[PDB]
Amino acid sequence: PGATLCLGHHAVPNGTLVKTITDDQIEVTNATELVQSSSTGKICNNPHRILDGIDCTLIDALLGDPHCDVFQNETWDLFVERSKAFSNCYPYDVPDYASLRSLVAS
């Protein structure tokens, strides 16, 4: 005349595989993803001030290419350059173009 008392823990029909020091794959009851691997495909306009360059590079806007003069006195947290931008003024180059673009963007 007595009783039995067993200790145990839960389980589920199928858990998730994770990596450890000793195992490339071992099953636990639950896990959570630490790598963000997807995007909606759209840039959110808040909280950062986004300035869409549209047909203009930042340098064309700086110099004041007429079709870019819409951008006069503009400000941004992030300036977004589009692959469709084009120059439409006197043909020019900027020695160290990359540096001028950087320091203005900043």
Binding site: T4, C6, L7, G8, H9, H10, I26
Partner: protein, 172 residues
């Protein structure tokens, strides 16, 4: 795991324990039953939530950085920019791999540990009134009704009340 309870002397988990991570199953004169252990469950849960919140805390904020894609071949300066970025990425990738490996090994061991601690605590309450059957179960050597089982589960079991009966059954 290091403690040998989970996937150890506990032969398997219970898919039917759906209200807790750890718990008890019993058989006595009034039938059989099951109950989650809230304290051990919450101890494991609290530790896991602790490490999760440490890991997902505070992404860094960066603004103007260096260019990472290039439309013209440039040689030396571009080579250096690309090498700096590749180097950075390989180091962070290593940190990420190692971080999850260490955390996960430790998570398995801490849950194994919590299981083992609950087992040891129960054994200690039972004193000389029960024996470890070696599969994570105790044989209790006295009549132990539902209220008695509950006294064990809630940590108020009084071994002296049952000691004469139990010793008589164990040793004679």
């Amino acid at each position: 795991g290091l403690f040998g309870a989970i996937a150890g002397f506990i032969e398997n988990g219970w898919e039917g324990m759906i209200d807790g991570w750890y718990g008890f199953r019993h058989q006595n004169s009034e039938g059989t039953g099951q109950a989650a252990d809230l304290k051990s469950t919450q101890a494991a849960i609290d530790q896991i939530n602790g490490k999760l919140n440490r890991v997902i805390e505070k992404t860094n904020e960066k603004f103007h950085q260096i260019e990472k894609e290039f439309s013209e071949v440039e040689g030396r300066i571009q080579d250096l920019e690309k090498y700096v970025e590749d180097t950075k990425i390989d180091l962070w990738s290593y940190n990420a791999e190692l971080l999850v490996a260490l955390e996960n090994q430790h998570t398995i061991d801490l849950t194994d540990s919590e299981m083992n601690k609950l087992f040891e605590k129960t054994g200690r309450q039972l004193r000389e009134n029960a024996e470890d059957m070696g599969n994570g179960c105790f044989k209790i050597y006295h009549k132990c009704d539902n209220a008695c089982i509950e006294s064990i589960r809630n940590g108020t079991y009084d071994h002296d009340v049952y000691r004469d009966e139990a010793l008589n059954n164990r040793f004679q």
